[PDB]
Write a protein that binds this ligand. Structure first.
Ligand SMILES: [Mg+2]
Ligand SMILES: [Zn+2]
Ligand SMILES: [Zn+2]
Lengths: 99, 1336, 79
RNA sequence: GGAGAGGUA
């Protein structure tokens, strides 16, 4: 029996740690993403993999909002995607976002 | 903000543009003062400050100085996030090649410059020179040379010719080429001379070339000159905390390449001998190759433990790659994990939850509520209060929980139902209670399975949960309308035991005035729980328009049933509660209840069902005792008899009168017979054992033996298990699939001896291993499946077409495997059906076939129906609603926006685990006989002999609806004609299954035309009997003398002239093939239909895997490529040759046929396309290209559903049809016309479909496409969006190609939207996404 | 208490836009200083909005009408 | 943080 509301954060990627030893959180796996897609549920998926895990400013302001009794969120962009972008650009590949 | 993603090459200039400095030193950290080095791999002046707004030398350490740089460090005082976004660069002393563009397979460099890859690798690894221009002399543009060749060439020709060796030479070559000029030259050359293989090669090379000019890429950029470097923070140097650090192999690769670079720099400064610099340059090239992608070279590199290091090319591939590890699946806050228990007292819409986990999860909400109540005017005091959980906090928790749903998930979530929302109820335990009915949906045993808990934070998430994922909303499996909340195993037992009846129980024959009296009587104990009694009740029939008419009656049932009736809702017939109520009965009852009284009554009824079932099951006290395993008395006698029988056979083999194999087979047969006898005997002795006096003398009834009650009720175990328990447990099969001659003659009530148990253990281990490997593979299969069909979303209402498919009830030679009523249930029609009052419009052409209309069809005995499929919907990037049909997850048409592809994929993939891995016609019914594809004659006996192959026999009933169907083998004798009347059990046809005759059509003399003994035939007259016999020899068997002649027999007559074919003017002559044994003589009468001569003759999960993958079969039964007469050509060139010739059309088509193929047709036959020329499996690609789309799709669905239903699993065809539609999504051009597409282009079917469609609005002629089919693993890769493919496997191959093409992704698929984390254009997000699309 | 959403879906036969309209109403209610139209029984805002949807006195069209009317009122409240 | 070993559903 174990739970985690908001704890530490992995270093290279800003996601909750894993395992009971650390105060980590569960892993919303790929198949579960598929399952959520099968329902019409879209908002919940977006929040779950954008603000509850990754986007730093998103979760900071989400914490503030929740404290302030105002359930709303600002998506932003996942950091790990920027990580992938930089990693690819380290190779000779020039990759970027348009307008 | 941003809309699209662009990818391409980078010039060295652009690399420098990105860079924020140059690295020069391989040193990183001092290990004594942990600040970084001056300009080492880690460095502040290049990357940035370590602490926020802190100068490294600390001359300035406050935010006031923001923007300035230090004069001692040149470091920019600013945040440390800059240390995660700054990239450095390395100036490489020598040019170097990019590994990916070298060993890409295909190698872009290789084919681009058009050199075999071996030569290129030789040149790049400093072992072979190559001329750059080599003009004004014997040499050519790009001749290669060895070392001695090079020195000789420069000696003899020390003129200006140049031959270099390495990346510099390659770069010179590439930069020294004009693309467009070569493009023109190559297109002119490929114009013709010659399209044999140069066709393909030139087309591909021209494709690459025109791609290059199409992008803003210059070829020489493949040769790295300046090397980017990752930001330090993305490759952090974690301390091991033992005073040392971890490995972080990336940094070691960096230091190694830096050392090589500096070493080469020094040597070049010193102008060392060329050999040394060449060796060092090779070393540097190898280091670069390792850094970019280690392992692709013949030897990877390892630091310790002989494990290769992690190259950049490894951070992306495989499961550990970012895509599949952190970018598609992530860890998440606000989560919990626990074991699960039943707690059956719960409502279906709520679940238990421990106090501790509940308190942990909702902490922020608790803080908010506390601050609102004012009990804590801060967050720290509030944290303290919750930390010591004052008594107040608990009521606050209860308040917060009031209406906040949560999500429950189980680990192996196969299908959509594997995760569901619930309301929470607090509990003073540490285990998540769970309403038992959903366990079936979760396939969750209580043997220690764990579950995970999530909470939806935002309001929209809560509403989504409540309105979509609440348990009470998911009651029908999406795979099929069947309910999914079946009372599983215990409640069913209770109910079955309740609705039984002893012949003579306490309180029998009396009369009751309603169920309440029944309950009271039973509770007082004055009557048994099941005894026959007449009681008055009131049914509620709502036949009127939503008006529940009550009607009373005085029925005769058993008290238990009456008591149970109290629960059922109003509008149901009492008959539904009048049987023994097996599991199937309960499931059907629930289904009907939902179909009639909507949703809420059904769920409440289910809850009451469960409560009552548990109560009365517990009351029953149905236990199991050893005495229940009743062994049949006659078993010993039966076994002894069988053994004695075996003895005589063993004797017969001892004397040698019989062989060994037959002994074995007969032994097995008699053993099976005896085992069956034993099983039947025990079953009979068990099920009816109960004999009870009825207040008369004596009677019998079904038995109450606990085991039989559990088995028949269906709670647990089929007859097989009870058979093993009581009777002998049959035969066991040894590892190689063989079956042991001696069966296991002992049951489990008795003890098995050693050997028996040994054999059983072997079998069980086989089973377990098979299960493990099966699930392992099934996971991969389903992962593939969902990947290919994730982009499809219904997006329209109606596409406005009329094409469809003729759904018909399935026949397998035997009975109706599935009636039509269930194949078309819930799918809109294409064209209105006309009743068999023909010209009688029975239904509209665009109505949904819900249950009532299906009943109309059934009472009208319809045969086949034109139904609108999905494979032909005219919607682009989606499918109109009507083409799909009903939801199948709720009783009404599909909504607009649903992601049908994903649910179809899940439905197909989930059941995979349950699968396995490794003469005459006897009609049996009185009716009309009908025959199709009949090309037959009457023989000498007056019967009917067929000469067509696909002839089919139907038995139709008096009404006129087909009832039975059977394939007619070729050349079979038939008693009847067509349209006669048959009797049940009347044999109607017969044939020989062994040999092939030379059956004729008409009576007359037979003449041995073009048959000379010695070189065409041999006089191999039969010696056993003495009748005339001469054998036409094969090509190889015949000598070279009679090769040119073609032996044949032409039907002749007394006059000697050739007889004519019936009807046609062509003369009749059967061309006798090789090895044609003829026992007839010359000029001898033979009648119609007579053999002139004689010539002799998996289903597991991998079957599905291959079939969907569209892999070609082992022995592809060739087909009739086109229509027209058949002929032969040049023979035995390793194979035979055949040429087809239309009646009028040209005839260039020939084929080369392996000698092993027994072609049934002869040259003298005109054959239509599609007809089998060989026997064996069939390749889907040809099926498509020769019979359009509706043929291949029907074949596929028939095959797959056959496999599935063979194991007893129900799946709707839509889920497969969508898959097929995705599979065939491409096209290939045959003629551009007024279009702008190159001929051999393979283009997305949709693009051409709209381009031609709009061009015809103009006075322009479109193109002439030709659809194509691909295995899923290929089609998923040949998709416009490259990111979607990249997240899929073999990232490198797709990514390199896309970068060369400079592709540009626009992000309108699902998976990519998930990657970038924005609302999916599928569900609720579909509305917003479409709205935003419209906004631009 | 709320156990089903069948009646709300009957009022709005799409089952997706239902979520969005209910969310907008509940957002007006929670952060926006608005009041319910049905007597609450110590229940959260989401269920209250859903019940409002159920009774049919609030749907997407009426919501559009109300937001436009209050926008006009605000544009008339500046002077 | 990464490897390897074992274990549960
Ligand atoms: Mg288990
Ligand atoms: Zn300084
Ligand atoms: Zn359509």
């Amino acid at each position: 029996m174990h739970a985690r509301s908001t704890g530490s954060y992995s270093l290279v990627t800003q996601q909750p740690l894993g395992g009971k030893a650390q105060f980590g959180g569960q892993r919303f796996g790929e198949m579960e993403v598929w399952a959520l897609e099968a329902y019409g549920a879209a908002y919940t998926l977006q929040e779950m993999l954008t603000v509850k895990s990754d986007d730093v400013n998103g979760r900071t302001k989400m914490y503030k909002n929740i404290v302030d009794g105002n359930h709303q969120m600002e998506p932003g962009m996942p950091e790990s995607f920027n990580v992938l972008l930089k990693e690819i650009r380290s190779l000779g590949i020039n990759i970027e976002l348009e307008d | 903000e941003f809309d699209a993603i662009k990818i391409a090459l980078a010039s060295p200039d652009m690399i420098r543009s990105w860079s924020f400095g140059e690295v020069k030193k391989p040193e990183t950290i001092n290990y004594r003062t942990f600040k970084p080095e001056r300009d080492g791999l880690f460095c502040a002046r290049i990357f940035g400050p370590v602490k926020d707004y802190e100068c490294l030398c600390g001359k300035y350490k406050r935010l006031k100085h923001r923007g300035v740089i230090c004069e001692k460090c040149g470091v920019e005082v600013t945040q440390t996030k800059v240390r995660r976004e700054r990239m450095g660069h390395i100036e490489l002393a020598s040019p170097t090649a990019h590994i990916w563009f070298l060993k890409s397979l295909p190698s872009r460099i290789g084919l681009l410059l058009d050199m075999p890859l071996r030569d290129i690798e030789r040149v790049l690894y400093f072992e072979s020179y190559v001329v750059i221009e080599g003009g004004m002399t014997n040499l050519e543009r790009q001749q290669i040379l060895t070392e001695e060749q090079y020195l000789d060439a420069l000696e003899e020709f020390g003129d200006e010719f140049d031959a270099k060796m390495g990346a510099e030479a390659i770069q010179a070559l590439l930069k020294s080429m004009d693309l467009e000029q070569e493009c023109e030259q190559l297109r002119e050359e490929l114009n013709e001379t010659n399209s044999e293989t140069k066709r393909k090669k030139l087309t591909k090379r021209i494709k690459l070339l025109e791609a290059f000019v199409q992008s803003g890429n210059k070829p020489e950029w493949m040769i790295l000159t300046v090397l980017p470097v990752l930001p330090p923070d993305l490759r952090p140097l974690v301390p091991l905390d033992g005073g040392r650090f971890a490995t972080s192999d990336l940094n070691d690769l960096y230091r190694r390449v830096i050392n090589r670079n500096n070493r080469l720099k020094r040597l070049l400064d010193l102008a060392a001998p060329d050999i040394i610099v060449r060796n060092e340059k090779r070393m540097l090239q190898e280091a670069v190759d390792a850094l970019l992608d280690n392992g692709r070279r013949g030897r990877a590199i390892t630091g310790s433990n002989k494990r290769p290091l992690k190259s950049l090319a490894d951070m992306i591939k495989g499961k550990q790659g970012r895509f599949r590890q952190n970018l598609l699946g992530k860890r998440v806050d606000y989560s919990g994990r626990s074991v699960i228990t039943v707690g059956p007292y719960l409502r279906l819409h709520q679940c238990g939850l421990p106090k501790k986990m509940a308190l942990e999860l909702f902490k922020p909400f608790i803080y908010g509520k506390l601050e609102l109540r004012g009990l804590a005017t801060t967050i720290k005091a509030a944290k303290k209060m919750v930390e010591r959980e004052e008594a107040v906090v608990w009521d606050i928790l209860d308040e917060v929980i009031r209406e906040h749903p949560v999500l429950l998930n189980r680990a192996p979530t196969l299908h959509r139902l594997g995760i569901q929302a619930f309301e929470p109820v607090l509990i003073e335990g540490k285990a998540i209670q769970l309403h038992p009915l959903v366990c079936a949906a979760y396939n969750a045993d209580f043997d220690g399975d764990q579950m995970a808990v999530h909470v939806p934070l935002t309001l929209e998430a809560q509403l989504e949960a409540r309105a979509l994922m609440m348990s009470t909303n998911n009651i029908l499996s999406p795979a099929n309308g069947e309910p999914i909340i079946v009372p599983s195993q215990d409640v069913v037992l209770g109910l079955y035991y309740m609705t039984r009846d002893c012949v003579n129980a306490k309180g029998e024959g009396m009369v009751l005035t309603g169920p309440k009296e029944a309950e009271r009587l039973y509770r007082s104990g004055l009557a048994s729980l099941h005894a026959r009694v007449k009681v008055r009740i009131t049914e509620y029939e709502k036949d009127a328009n939503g008006e529940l008419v009550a009607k009373t009656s005085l029925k005769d049932t058993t008290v238990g049933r009456a008591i149970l009736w109290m629960i059922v809702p109003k509008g149901l017939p009492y008959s539904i509660v009048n049987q023994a109520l097996g599991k199937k009965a309960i499931s059907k009852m629930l289904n009907t209840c939902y179909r009639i009284l909507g949703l809420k009554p059904t769920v409440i009824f289910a809850d009451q069902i469960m409560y009552t079932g548990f109560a009365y099951a517990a009351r029953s006290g149905a236990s199991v005792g050893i005495d229940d395993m009743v062994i049949p008395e006659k078993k010993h006698e039966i076994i002894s008899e069988a053994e004695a029988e075996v003895a005589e056979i063993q004797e017969q083999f001892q004397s040698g009168l019989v062989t060994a194999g037959e002994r074995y087979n007969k032994v097995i047969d008699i053993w099976a017979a005896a085992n069956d006898r034993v099983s039947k005997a025990m079953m009979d002795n068990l099920q009816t054992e109960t004999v009870i006096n009825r207040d008369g003398q004596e009677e019998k009834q079904v038995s109450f033996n606990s085991i039989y009650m559990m088995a028949d009720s269906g709670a647990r175990g089929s007859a097989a298990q009870i058979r093993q328990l009581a009777g002998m447990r049959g035969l066991m099969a040894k590892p190689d699939g063989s079956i042991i001659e001696t069966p296991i003659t002992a049951n489990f009530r008795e003890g098995l001896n050693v050997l028996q148990y040994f054999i059983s253990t072997h079998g069980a281990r086989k089973g377990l291993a098979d299960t493990a490997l099966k699930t392992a593979n099934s996971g991969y299969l389903t992962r593939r499946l969902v990947d290919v069909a994730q982009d499809l979303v219904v997006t329209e209402d109606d596409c406005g077409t009329h094409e469809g498919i003729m759904m018909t009830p399935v026949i397998e030679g035997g009975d109706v495997k599935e009636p039509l009523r269930d194949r078309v249930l819930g799918r809109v029609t294409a064209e209105d059906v006309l009743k068999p009052g023909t010209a009688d419009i029975l239904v509209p052409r665009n109505t949904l076939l819900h249950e009532q209309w299906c009943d109309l069809l059934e009472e009208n005995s319809v045969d086949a129906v034109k139904v609108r499929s999905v494979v032909s919907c005219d919607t682009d990037f989606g499918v109109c609603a009507h083409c799909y049909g009903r939801d199948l997850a709720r009783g009404h048409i599909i909504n607009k926006g649903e992601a049908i592809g994903v649910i179809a994929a899940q439905s197909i993939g989930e059941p995979g685990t349950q699968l396995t891995m490794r003469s005459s016609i006897q009609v049996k019914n009185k009716g009309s006989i009908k025959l199709s594809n009949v090309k037959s004659v009457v023989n000498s006996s007056g019967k009917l002999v067929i000469t067509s192959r696909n002839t089919e026999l139907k038995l139709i009933d008096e009404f006129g609806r087909t009832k039975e169907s059977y394939k007619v083998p070729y050349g079979a004798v038939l008693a009847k004609g067509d349209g006669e009347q048959v009797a049940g059990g009347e044999t109607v046809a017969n044939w020989d299954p062994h040999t092939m005759p030379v059956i004729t059509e008409v009576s007359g003399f037979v003449r041995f035309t073009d048959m000379i003994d010695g070189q065409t035939i041999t006089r191999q007259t039969d010696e056993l009997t003495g009748l005339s016999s001469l054998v036409v020899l094969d090509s190889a068997e015949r000598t070279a003398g009679g090769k040119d002649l073609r032996p044949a027999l032409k039907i002749v007559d007394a006059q000697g002239n050739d007889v004519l074919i019936p009807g046609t003017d062509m003369p009749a002559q059967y061309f006798l093939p090789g090895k044609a044994i003829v026992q007839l003589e010359d000029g001898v009468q033979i009648s119609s239909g007579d053999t002139l001569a004689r010539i002799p003759q998996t289903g597991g999960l991998p079957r599905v895997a291959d079939l969907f993958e569209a892999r070609r079969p082992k022995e592809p039964a060739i087909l009739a490529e086109i229509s027209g007469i058949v002929s032969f050509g040049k023979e035995t060139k390793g194979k035979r040759r055949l040429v087809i010739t239309p009646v009028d059309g040209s005839d260039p088509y020939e084929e080369m046929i392996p000698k092993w193929r027994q072609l049934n047709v002869f040259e003298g036959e005109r054959v239509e396309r599609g007809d089998v020329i060989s026997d064996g499996p069939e390749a889907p690609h040809d099926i498509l290209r020769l019979r359009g789309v509706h043929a291949v799709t029907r074949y596929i669905v028939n095959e797959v559903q056959d496999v599935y239903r063979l194991q007893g699993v129900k799946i709707n065809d839509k889920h497969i049809e969508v898959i097929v539609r995705q599979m065939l999504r491409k096209a290939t051009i045959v003629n551009a016309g007024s279009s702008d597409f190159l001929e051999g282009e393979q283009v997305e079917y949709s693009r051409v479909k709209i381009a031609n469609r709009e061009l015809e609005a103009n006075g322009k002629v479109g193109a002439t496409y030709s659809r194509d089919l691909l295995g899923i693993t290929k089609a998923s890769l040949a998709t416009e969006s490259f990111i979607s493919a990249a997240s899929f496997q073999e990232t490198t191959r797709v990514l390199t190609e896309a970068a060369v093409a400079g592709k540009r992704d626009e992000l309108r698929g699902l998976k990519e939207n998930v990657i970038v984390g924005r609302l999916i254009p599928a569900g609720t997000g579909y509305a917003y996404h479409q709205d935003r699309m419209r906004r631009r | 208490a709320r156990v089903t959403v069948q009646d709300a879906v009957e009022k709005i036969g799409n089952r997706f836009d239902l979520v969005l309209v209910a969310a907008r109403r509940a957002r007006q209610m929670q952060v926006g200083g608005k009041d319910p139209l049905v007597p609450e029984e110590n229940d959260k805002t989401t269920v209250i909005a859903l019940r409002e949807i159920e009774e049919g006195l609030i749907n997407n069209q009426i919501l559009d009408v109300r937001e436009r009317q209050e926008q006009q009122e605000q544009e008339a409240a500046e002077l």
